[model samples]
Target: SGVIKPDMKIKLKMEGNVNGYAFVIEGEGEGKPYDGTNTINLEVKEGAPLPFSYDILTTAFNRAFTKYPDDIPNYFKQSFPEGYSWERTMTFEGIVKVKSDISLEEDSFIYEIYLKGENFPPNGPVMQKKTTGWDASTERMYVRDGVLKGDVKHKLLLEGGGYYRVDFKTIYRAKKAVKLPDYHFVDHRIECLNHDKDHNKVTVYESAVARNST
Candidate 1:
């Protein structure tokens, strides 16, 4: 058996705030929108180059299987022992991509991607993203911006009856509390179960405490 490594790289550029703080009114007026405080100015830049190597034993099975009829096979589930569960309304942001030249012989290919921040929260249990059609194609797996795009390049691999199944995995650490866009916030604190095998899973690998602001 041979392992394929990922050689792709990603760059992230973040700007502006989502709390309606970017716009300010210079002139004083009753109807004018005053310049709100830029209390929160944060920029998070991080990346992880293929963190681990997923086995290709069931690549063929994944390609042929239909997700609607049933969930992933029991053997596949064993790869990720932990189920999707949340302890709190934790949030995180970072860049993820596949690494080039991975090999199956190695225990696990350690992706170059990593997390960086100040006073990150403690570590917690992990979760995995569910498989999708795209995951079976590209061999590259990614979950970002609230969407999981699996197997970015499956067409080429599918030739000659070759199958592919990308793993749903991530490496993250909890950091300082940052304000997210209105749309990104989870409305209620209810502990709803996330069983959608088609979407990415946000595991609270770490938890950050609320910081005191000026």
Candidate 2:
């Protein structure tokens, strides 16, 4: 395990819409930051009748973290110097979907979400964007902007056909630190259909990793 000094800083940026309203949150690390050792980043997105403002979405996020606590040593084992403790900086992007349901009658709705982590591993030093092929094995749909980029699929099994498919390319930026789990993987999910309407309501949950330079 590595020790993160009190002076170390962690920063976060989030931008999105909730219930048709735009929101953004940004801040630097407050407590002792993780020394970028054994760090994990998770991202999630859900599409359903529940708006981004719904508690279910927040609950889903909290539940995700609960599965992996921020201060757990076994899962996120990293030491901080005196006067420092594990710090979490989060940004909330409001509702990306205003209309509860998307119809095939019209073009599918498109949403864009972004997540980033600082001081994580695979330490490089430059901020460059890299793209990769979308995974079709997973049951999820994807689209860039509002156009379908790949085949539409479902992540969960449903009684009938699932929700609309989403397609989007992920971009990973270079980092500047070295430690275990030397790369930060951020997860993203896109739900092509609203809840109840289609079995495929929940689609597109993906994780992308970013590396830091030495």
Candidate 3:
């Protein structure tokens, strides 16, 4: 076989509620650049009856890849290649939009999304913002996931009395990217949760990790 080129690693995980049922979507992919094979998993809340079949889930996810949130600008879309995002939150929202297409009535759904990208320049620190309402203030936090670090945890209070919590860690391996230079693959886990304890008390959690090739 030909030499395997150095590849970048990225993973996305999302959790949300749909028609009163909870669903989680996770995907991890590795690539020489932006093209590669991936595995995506769709899971409904445990013990809850799934309204749709695996086939429908597959169709919805495929459609999601081609869609984007209305608020995101076209330039950002053009600037970043596929499998990446300038605003990962909105991107995850697009992927977790299994609502009207899930064939359920349009109702309230809470969302929490996580993305772990390879260690590279453009892929800087993990900075994120959260808010409860349009008029509400925003909360921001930043953390770095680099080589030889243990799990890191962060917590913040929302503007309106809710909370945000996240734990992240990264692992590095030099051997995997030997043949291909200028980039490195990383293994990381980002588990995050958001709660609006003041309002309807809805809570959402997300978990994702880029695989460390064996």
Candidate 4:
């Protein structure tokens, strides 16, 4: 009946170079390592709270059933208008297994999750949902180290990670497949520039442009 709000916050700290200029975007939102020149590295850290702090896919799935159970009827009714009577007799148990490893994109606020659902009668369709929404914001910008120009692409690396499994024996009303939903808002942004007083402002005129494609 109601929407599931964002239960987790994201904080991203990244340091890399576009072509050969110093590039940094930190504080909030999402970002990854830029590919150009050399020495490119970006560090991303998730800010999910307890429960959500681990197994985000499963956490979202569990929450969807408990928080918004109406979505199930909406989806099933739309998919099967004639014989869609599962909502009246069946319930959502849990996820059996994931078909692929889950990961988030650096610049996009949307993603997908794929898995098989567990039911009491041991017969249910696989679960898959795309169009999970993510919202991003830009806080500040700056120029530094001569002129930043050229083009670059982002590269992501998972420095630290792990996995966990949860067992379920309880059954609840059928809720629609879980999606990222509104848990995609960013907090802040900041870009540091080569300022004077700290070092020689590279007494030179320059022009640069950074572009990303594919």
What is the clash count for each candidate, in the order shown?
A: 24, 27, 0, 4
The worst-scoring run of ten residues by lDDT in candidate 4 lies at: 81-90
Please tell me which predicted candidate would have the highest TM-score against the true structure.
3
Which model, 1 or 4, shows the larger TM-score?
1
Please give the lDDT score for candidate 2: 0.23
Cα lDDT, model 2, residue 174: 13
Candidate 1 residue 44 C-alpha distance from true site, Å: 28
List TM-scores for all candidates, in order: 0.16, 0.23, 0.24, 0.16
Alpha-carbon deviation at 107 in model 2, angstroms: 44
**Local error of candidate 2 at 164, Å?**
1.8
Ranking by TM-score: 3, 2, 1, 4
Error at 30, model 2, angstroms:
16
Model 1 lDDT tens row, 1-214: 2121122111212221111112110111011001111011112222211111111111110111111112212111122212111111112221122222111113221112112212212231111111121221212223345332232222212323443432334221112222221211001011112222321121111111111111
lDDT of 3 by residue, 1-214 (tens): 1112233333444454433445566534333321222223333334234332221122122111212223322111132222111122112111223221111012211122532222212221111223222211111212233212223333333445664443323222221111211221222211222323321212222222222222
**What is the descending lDDT order?**
3, 2, 4, 1
Instruction: Give me the overall lDDT of model 4.
Output: 0.20
TM-score preference between candidates 3 and 4, better one:
3
Number of the candidate with higher lDDT, 1 or 4? 4
Cα RMSDs, all models: 23.8, 17.9, 17.2, 22.8
What is candidate 4's lDDT per residue for 25-136, written digit by digit as tens?
2322222211101111122222211111111122211111111222222221121112111101111223333222112233222212233333313221111111111112
Candidate 3, residue 34: Cα displacement in angstroms equals 4.8
Candidate 3 lDDT (Cα, whole model)? 0.26
Instruction: Determine which window of 10 residues in candidate 2 has minimal summed lDDT.
Output: 58-67
